[PDB]
Amino acid sequence: KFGKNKSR
């Protein structure tokens, strides 16, 4: 739940 905002 740390690399979930590493998409866009």
Distance CA 1, CA 4 (A): 6
CA atoms within 13 A on the CB side of 1: 0
> Who's near 6: CB < 8 A, 6+ residues apart?
none
Q: Read off the tokens for 8.
A: 């866009």
DSSP per residue, 1-8? --STT---
Distance CA 3, CA 8 (A): 11
- Exp. method: NMR
Q: Dihedrals φ, ψ of 6, to 5°?
A: -115, 30
Q: Read off the tokens for 7.
A: 């998409």
